[PDB]
Write an enzyme that holds these catalytic residues in place. Structure first.
Site, PDB file in Angstrom:
ATOM      1  N   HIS A 278     -36.927 -38.393   2.356  1.00 31.48           N
ATOM      2  CA  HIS A 278     -35.939 -39.092   3.337  1.00 31.48           C
ATOM      3  C   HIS A 278     -36.454 -39.478   4.644  1.00 31.48           C
ATOM      4  CE1 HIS A 278     -31.691 -40.163   3.987  1.00 31.48           C
ATOM      5  NE2 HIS A 278     -31.646 -39.370   4.911  1.00 31.48           N
TER       6      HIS A 278
HETATM    7  C1  FAD Z   1     -35.053 -36.368  15.849  1.00 25.19           C
HETATM    8  C2  FAD Z   1     -35.069 -35.918  14.421  1.00 25.19           C
HETATM    9  C3  FAD Z   1     -35.530 -36.521  13.265  1.00 25.19           C
HETATM   10  C4  FAD Z   1     -35.323 -36.268  11.977  1.00 25.19           C
HETATM   11  N1  FAD Z   1     -36.183 -36.816  10.982  1.00 25.19           N
HETATM   12  C5  FAD Z   1     -35.915 -36.718   9.851  1.00 25.19           C
HETATM   13  C6  FAD Z   1     -36.359 -37.341   8.529  1.00 25.19           C
HETATM   14  O1  FAD Z   1     -36.753 -38.596   8.579  1.00 25.19           O
HETATM   15  N2  FAD Z   1     -36.527 -36.802   7.190  1.00 25.19           N
HETATM   16  C7  FAD Z   1     -35.985 -35.481   7.155  1.00 25.19           C
HETATM   17  O2  FAD Z   1     -35.864 -35.097   5.938  1.00 25.19           O
HETATM   18  N3  FAD Z   1     -35.398 -34.843   8.059  1.00 25.19           N
HETATM   19  C8  FAD Z   1     -35.448 -35.204   9.214  1.00 25.19           C
HETATM   20  N4  FAD Z   1     -34.843 -34.594  10.386  1.00 25.19           N
HETATM   21  C9  FAD Z   1     -34.266 -33.050  10.202  1.00 25.19           C
HETATM   22  C10 FAD Z   1     -33.036 -32.955   9.500  1.00 25.19           C
HETATM   23  O3  FAD Z   1     -32.074 -33.884  10.284  1.00 25.19           O
HETATM   24  C11 FAD Z   1     -32.176 -31.735   9.282  1.00 25.19           C
HETATM   25  O4  FAD Z   1     -33.213 -30.988   8.481  1.00 25.19           O
HETATM   26  C12 FAD Z   1     -31.035 -31.831   8.586  1.00 25.19           C
HETATM   27  O5  FAD Z   1     -30.014 -32.258   9.082  1.00 25.19           O
HETATM   28  C13 FAD Z   1     -30.468 -30.233   8.233  1.00 25.19           C
HETATM   29  O6  FAD Z   1     -29.128 -30.302   7.693  1.00 25.19           O
HETATM   30  P1  FAD Z   1     -28.310 -28.956   8.007  1.00 25.19           P
HETATM   31  O7  FAD Z   1     -27.131 -29.231   7.201  1.00 25.19           O
HETATM   32  O8  FAD Z   1     -28.971 -27.956   7.619  1.00 25.19           O
HETATM   33  O9  FAD Z   1     -27.991 -29.363   9.462  1.00 25.19           O
HETATM   34  P2  FAD Z   1     -27.107 -30.571   9.972  1.00 25.19           P
HETATM   35  O10 FAD Z   1     -27.220 -31.837   9.711  1.00 25.19           O
HETATM   36  O11 FAD Z   1     -27.849 -30.081  11.292  1.00 25.19           O
HETATM   37  O12 FAD Z   1     -25.568 -30.055  10.273  1.00 25.19           O
HETATM   38  C14 FAD Z   1     -25.116 -29.169  11.097  1.00 25.19           C
HETATM   39  C15 FAD Z   1     -23.625 -29.406  11.537  1.00 25.19           C
HETATM   40  O13 FAD Z   1     -23.435 -28.273  12.074  1.00 25.19           O
HETATM   41  C16 FAD Z   1     -22.263 -28.382  13.077  1.00 25.19           C
HETATM   42  N5  FAD Z   1     -22.111 -27.380  14.162  1.00 25.19           N
HETATM   43  C17 FAD Z   1     -22.956 -26.442  14.754  1.00 25.19           C
HETATM   44  N6  FAD Z   1     -22.434 -25.333  15.049  1.00 25.19           N
HETATM   45  C18 FAD Z   1     -21.455 -25.329  14.627  1.00 25.19           C
HETATM   46  C19 FAD Z   1     -20.249 -24.447  14.503  1.00 25.19           C
HETATM   47  N7  FAD Z   1     -20.213 -23.110  14.907  1.00 25.19           N
HETATM   48  N8  FAD Z   1     -18.935 -25.223  14.473  1.00 25.19           N
HETATM   49  C20 FAD Z   1     -18.789 -26.125  13.913  1.00 25.19           C
HETATM   50  N9  FAD Z   1     -19.830 -27.162  13.956  1.00 25.19           N
HETATM   51  C21 FAD Z   1     -21.063 -26.686  14.204  1.00 25.19           C
HETATM   52  C22 FAD Z   1     -23.335 -29.647  14.027  1.00 25.19           C
HETATM   53  O14 FAD Z   1     -22.404 -30.252  14.607  1.00 25.19           O
HETATM   54  C23 FAD Z   1     -23.813 -30.464  12.833  1.00 25.19           C
HETATM   55  O15 FAD Z   1     -23.000 -31.663  12.404  1.00 25.19           O
HETATM   56  C24 FAD Z   1     -34.865 -34.927  11.585  1.00 25.19           C
HETATM   57  C25 FAD Z   1     -34.209 -34.182  12.810  1.00 25.19           C
HETATM   58  C26 FAD Z   1     -34.233 -34.664  14.022  1.00 25.19           C
HETATM   59  C27 FAD Z   1     -33.670 -34.079  15.358  1.00 25.19           C
HETATM   60  N1  GCG Z   2     -32.715 -37.853  -1.886  1.00 25.20           N
HETATM   61  C1  GCG Z   2     -32.637 -36.929  -1.164  1.00 25.20           C
HETATM   62  C2  GCG Z   2     -31.239 -36.909   0.012  1.00 25.20           C
HETATM   63  C3  GCG Z   2     -31.058 -38.062   0.783  1.00 25.20           C
HETATM   64  C4  GCG Z   2     -29.765 -38.074   1.590  1.00 25.20           C
HETATM   65  O1  GCG Z   2     -29.853 -37.654   2.970  1.00 25.20           O
HETATM   66  N2  GCG Z   2     -28.720 -38.770   1.329  1.00 25.20           N
HETATM   67  C5  GCG Z   2     -27.530 -38.631   2.157  1.00 25.20           C
HETATM   68  C6  GCG Z   2     -26.948 -39.989   2.631  1.00 25.20           C
HETATM   69  S1  GCG Z   2     -26.544 -40.398   4.240  1.00 25.20           S
HETATM   70  C7  GCG Z   2     -26.503 -37.584   1.845  1.00 25.20           C
HETATM   71  O2  GCG Z   2     -25.776 -37.999   0.543  1.00 25.20           O
HETATM   72  N3  GCG Z   2     -26.237 -36.535   2.045  1.00 25.20           N
HETATM   73  C8  GCG Z   2     -25.303 -35.473   1.680  1.00 25.20           C
HETATM   74  C9  GCG Z   2     -23.914 -35.981   1.335  1.00 25.20           C
HETATM   75  O3  GCG Z   2     -23.595 -37.042   1.847  1.00 25.20           O
HETATM   76  N4  GCG Z   2     -22.911 -35.320   0.584  1.00 25.20           N
HETATM   77  C10 GCG Z   2     -21.586 -35.721   0.272  1.00 25.20           C
HETATM   78  C11 GCG Z   2     -21.245 -36.415  -0.938  1.00 25.20           C
HETATM   79  C12 GCG Z   2     -21.737 -37.820  -1.433  1.00 25.20           C
HETATM   80  C13 GCG Z   2     -21.503 -38.819  -0.489  1.00 25.20           C
HETATM   81  N5  GCG Z   2     -22.173 -39.027   0.549  1.00 25.20           N
HETATM   82  C14 GCG Z   2     -22.391 -40.727   0.935  1.00 25.20           C
HETATM   83  C15 GCG Z   2     -21.357 -41.110   1.811  1.00 25.20           C
HETATM   84  C16 GCG Z   2     -21.372 -42.639   2.127  1.00 25.20           C
HETATM   85  N6  GCG Z   2     -22.484 -43.077   2.876  1.00 25.20           N
HETATM   86  C17 GCG Z   2     -23.674 -43.150   2.701  1.00 25.20           C
HETATM   87  O4  GCG Z   2     -24.344 -42.589   1.763  1.00 25.20           O
HETATM   88  C18 GCG Z   2     -24.564 -43.908   3.833  1.00 25.20           C
HETATM   89  N7  GCG Z   2     -25.884 -43.375   3.408  1.00 25.20           N
HETATM   90  C19 GCG Z   2     -27.159 -43.831   3.620  1.00 25.20           C
HETATM   91  O5  GCG Z   2     -27.117 -45.003   4.273  1.00 25.20           O
HETATM   92  C20 GCG Z   2     -28.466 -43.107   3.520  1.00 25.20           C
HETATM   93  C21 GCG Z   2     -29.018 -42.459   4.600  1.00 25.20           C
HETATM   94  S2  GCG Z   2     -28.500 -40.749   4.853  1.00 25.20           S
HETATM   95  N8  GCG Z   2     -29.318 -43.800   2.593  1.00 25.20           N
HETATM   96  C22 GCG Z   2     -29.864 -43.242   1.654  1.00 25.20           C
HETATM   97  O6  GCG Z   2     -30.141 -41.753   1.844  1.00 25.20           O
HETATM   98  C23 GCG Z   2     -30.913 -43.818   0.497  1.00 25.20           C
HETATM   99  C24 GCG Z   2     -32.232 -44.331   1.389  1.00 25.20           C
HETATM  100  C25 GCG Z   2     -31.902 -45.768   1.929  1.00 25.20           C
HETATM  101  N9  GCG Z   2     -31.072 -46.590   1.080  1.00 25.20           N
HETATM  102  C26 GCG Z   2     -33.099 -46.491   2.370  1.00 25.20           C
HETATM  103  O7  GCG Z   2     -33.175 -47.791   2.182  1.00 25.20           O
HETATM  104  O8  GCG Z   2     -34.220 -45.828   2.442  1.00 25.20           O
HETATM  105  C27 GCG Z   2     -32.674 -35.816  -1.941  1.00 25.20           C
HETATM  106  O9  GCG Z   2     -31.693 -35.241  -1.905  1.00 25.20           O
HETATM  107  O10 GCG Z   2     -33.809 -35.475  -2.402  1.00 25.20           O
END
Ligand code: FAD
Ligand code: GCG
Ligand code: FAD
Ligand code: GCG
Lengths: 486, 483
Positions: A460
């Protein structure tokens, strides 16, 4: 033993050079290789290196890369890039110049290769069989031409490749083939590419990026839709995206004759009665094996539909005579020709026989956007399998949401044998599709199942990760009938 | 009242909340501090990836990549008034804000339309193993807005930047602020050799003003620790060739704001340099404190919550997935763990995430794609290791002018049976190419499976099907070569 050479290769192309190299190197055999020119260009166009190098894959990929910059320059604006767009222009002669230098360097590279290899010798001229163990080398294609060399040999390999097919219609002499297109001095403002195949489709994109001020690129095809043989969804989608980028596509149209107007223009009348004017008319309707000049009857080598007939091991119906590559009319691609050559040399000068699997061969179409494909298309799979499942996914790549090219939809399609989940084919449309399909080509070789795709964690964010996110089929094919789940 | 309460509406949280309410018809409550991206909390509904991670950085890397295309286009005959070229940082920022905002909305829309799925804005903390509280602040003395009793709790708070305790750290920012800068820095210092630091350096390098300069410093000897040594060396040469300044074995000691508003940075060596922006990207740590975890007694091991292979903690009804567990901090992994957890808890089949052979990328310029083990590791776990290397300047780079852009492909195998232990790539489109091979490793492919595949020609990826002879081996940790 008696006969000076161990192997005589007619044609120094992808398969010929691979064959020749392995036998001299790996098996220490004295090989003679023949070809018509030393460097690319008119009058014979191909030369040392074959079609791919001289008038194929190499030059067209560079020209396609150049055309792609039109996309880049237009899309950069969506990301804040500014410049005076009124000063933008594409210099065709610069492209052609850099292409010519790139190919020439490869031509030279192959020349020194011979000069540095013992047992490997090159002969300039037109080769033909005098008998099944004697190959003549003449000054020209004419069989009554002066003989420059006469090579006695123990084994002969026919690797003459193919040549464009010009249809016999009135005015064909006013048209060109992909061969002349690589050496045009200026890009045509009005050009017509006749054909729905990949060559026609790729050149249409090239011409579209370098056309002058009031230019228009028109592609015409006899049948219903472009790219016959490819997945129907991709054929439909690519048609939309090409049209969206200014290419006029005329299907269900077929030329009747080409007339040369006094002002050097060409007038084309279609069987429909429609008549249009173009500056350049290019025929890209197909390529035929070059068997004609070989004088195959002098050895009794059998030709089937156009090409030389061969068995699975590339052996002809005549002992000690083999044929590989495009002249066999199997899968006309460079990587396949190379695989056949290496397998053939092993079967002949080696211990274990070996053959090329012509199934699950991945390939691409460098159109804009490009296509990547491996395996069967549902139309064929459904006729070979009782239960087929079709997984489909269409989305807008992230960058194109903000780049302005809203129309650039990425289509991913996986088809499987629903009875056991075996992946029968993967078909893609969108940026980098040719790079993504290589890795899956290996997967099909490993007999991967759909479960194997979705149980892999995706990278991703990328377009490629979408192939690992298709868990439920969209529709199925039960005994050829399309069906769904209620 | 709720069947499951998810603390954190991120990549993993939303995934669990979704199919639990969907596939298992359970009543789920999801908590998150913010609904739209940006200050004050930066992250929001959607998580880090969506708000301040993968999505926004990917759009920005695409933007930075145009400096390459604009320059390189000249080699294919494209000409224009190159003196009128200027990059607009605010348009870039404006469009990404739009794109992110639409995704935030898409999720809000999701809650209203999905029965049994409810969103609670605020901060969640454990009151007891069955009680969850939603307050108005991270401070456990703030007004309780909601109180919830559930038999199941899922922790998915994610991580947060690690800012070091040095004098002047209040003049430095993290990757969070970077996404909202109003103007691009003239001189910027990125601290860290990790991927976040490397990616942002390429972004700043492309949008830097007229007489700008980008500096990357790292405590270690070479950037991207944990990555294949050849890729580390080669990428360094290419970042340097593009004007980026890399200072290895340097680490800031203090940051003094000086007169004109710039910052004087003094490194531990005594070197002193001025910068207009100093971004700290040295680490990410799990957010566990604000959860008041001792109220239920959930174990912590090394910053993150202690969990087993099935994401269960030490307290029967509490589970943890994602960055908060400190396993593999990537979005696809967090998503996988979420679905597996939901199955193991509300389904017939216990299911766990395979954390090995996961493919990943670094969107630097040029990018990196990798899957599997690096030779430093493989030679310790295996007695006979074979290394296949291929370095070459792609076709287009001969003609584009960027002759320094060498493409590198390396394949590591267990020479006793030919099994592919790892594949590492450097070059344009490496992230797209690696995905497909990621599947290959799950299918335990051998090197023969690669070179027996017919290649796609012409492409960079076909080089992976042309490597058949090892460059060198590793016998019992020793490097050896066939004579
Ligand atoms: C600069 C950057 C670039 C990255 N690029 C990539 C990439 O290209 N590809 C990739 O795979 N990964 C990437 N990552 C890592 C990826 O974003 C994380 O691994 C992923 O978001 C983890 O999902 P999660 O649900 O564990 O955490 P999150 O998406 O971190 O969700 C955690 C949520 O918990 C909330 N929160 C915290 N504590 C509390 C609380 N006590 N109460 C309420 N809300 C709370 C936060 O607001 C947040 O919305 C990147 C990260 C960073 C920072
Ligand atoms: N394929 C990876 C995961 C990829 C990923 O991060 N997907 C995100 C989408 S943002 C996701 O679905 N996260 C969990 C989630 O959302 N769970 C809830 C239930 C399903 C509905 N979620 C989608 C809501 C609508 N909006 C979008 O989905 C907007 N997303 C995007 O635009 C994403 C970026 S996070 N595109 C993709 O993830 C696809 C790649 C992209 N099209 C490309 O061009 O490379 C994997 O599982 O191996
Ligand atoms: C415009 C175009 C685009 C293409 N693009 C792709 C692509 O991107 N990817 C891909 O995989 N394939 C592509 N191909 C196809 C690929 O070029 C061929 O499949 C490949 O060249 C076949 O190898 P070969 O050994 O059969 O023949 P060739 O490489 O064609 O070599 C045949 C040689 O025989 C010589 N010759 C002919 N007759 C005689 C004679 N009697 N005496 C002596 N010498 C003789 C010819 O001069 C020529 O050098 C393309 C083809 C064309 C024309
Ligand atoms: N399946 C092929 C893939 C590469 C390829 O197409 N090679 C062609 C060269 S065009 C080839 O070698 N054909 C047979 C042949 O020549 N056999 C004799 C053995 C020696 C090989 N060649 C020695 C001379 C050195 N120069 C070249 O071979 C010039 N080739 C190229 O430039 C080719 C284009 S046809 N490169 C690639 O296709 C590489 C891909 C590229 N790096 C990309 O990123 O797009 C393979 O396995 O080798």
């Amino acid at each position: 033993m008696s006969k000076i050479f161990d192997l005589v290769v007619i044609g120094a192309g992808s398969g010929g050079l691979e064959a020749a190299w392995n036998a001299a190197t790996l098996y220490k055999k004295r090989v003679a290789v023949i070809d018509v020119q030393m460097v690319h260009g008119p009058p014979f166009f191909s030369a040392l290196g074959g079609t791919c190098v001289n008038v194929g894959c190499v030059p067209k990929k560079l020209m396609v890369t150049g055309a792609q910059y039109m996309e880049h320059l237009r899309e950069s604006a969506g990301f804040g890039w500014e410049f005076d767009r009124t000063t933008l222009r594409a210099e065709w002669k610069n492209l052609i110049a850099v292409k010519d230098e790139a190919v020439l360097n490869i031509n030279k590279s192959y020349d020194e290769m011979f000069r540095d290899t013992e047992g490997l010798e090159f002969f300039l001229g037109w080769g033909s069989l005098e008998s099944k163990n004697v190959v003549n080398v003449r000054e020209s294609a004419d069989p009554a031409s002066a003989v420059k060399e006469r090579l006695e040999t123990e084994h002969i390999l026919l690797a003459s490749g193919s040549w464009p097919h010009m249809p016999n219609i009135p005015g064909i002499e006013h048209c060109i083939s992909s061969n002349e297109a690589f050496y045009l001095p200026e890009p045509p403002r009005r050009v017509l590419t006749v054909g729905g195949g990949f060559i026609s489709v790729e050149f249409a994109g090239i011409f579209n990026a370098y056309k002058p001020k009031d230019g228009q690129v028109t592609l015409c095809y006899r049948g219903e839709m472009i790219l016959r043989g490819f997945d129907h969804t991709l054929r439909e989608e690519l048609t939309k995206q090409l049209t969206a980028n200014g290419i006029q596509i005329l299907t269900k149209e077929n030329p009747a004759k080409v007339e040369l107007n006094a002002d050097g223009s060409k007038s084309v009348t279609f069987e429909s009665g429609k008549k249009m004017d173009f500056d350049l008319v290019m025929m890209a309707i197909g390529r035929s094996p070059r068997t004609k000049d070989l004088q195959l009857q002098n050895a009794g080598v059998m030709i089937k539909n156009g090409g030389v007939q061969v068995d699975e091991y590339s052996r002809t119906n005549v002992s000690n005579i083999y044929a590989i590559g495009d002249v066999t009319n199997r899968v006309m691609l460079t990587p396949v020709a190379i695989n056949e050559a290496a397998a053939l040399v092993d079967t002949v000068f080696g211990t274990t026989p070996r053959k090329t699997d012509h199934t699950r061969v991945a390939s691409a179409v460098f159109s804009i956007p490009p296509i990547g494909t491996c395996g069967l298309i549902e139309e064929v799979a459904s006729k070979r399998y009782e239960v087929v499942a079709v997984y489909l996914s269409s989305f807008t790549p992230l960058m194109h949401k903000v780049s302005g090219s809203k129309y650039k939809t990425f289509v991913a399609k996986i088809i499987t044998n629903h009875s056991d989940g075996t992946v029968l084919g993967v078909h893609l449309l969108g940026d980098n599709a040719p790079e993504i399909i290589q890795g899956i080509g290996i997967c099909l070789k490993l007999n991967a199942k759909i479960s194997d795709f979705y149980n892999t964690i995706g990278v991703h964010p990328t377009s490629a990760e979408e192939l690992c996110s298709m868990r439920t089929p969209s529709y199925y094919y039960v005994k050829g009938e399309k069906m769904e789940k209620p």
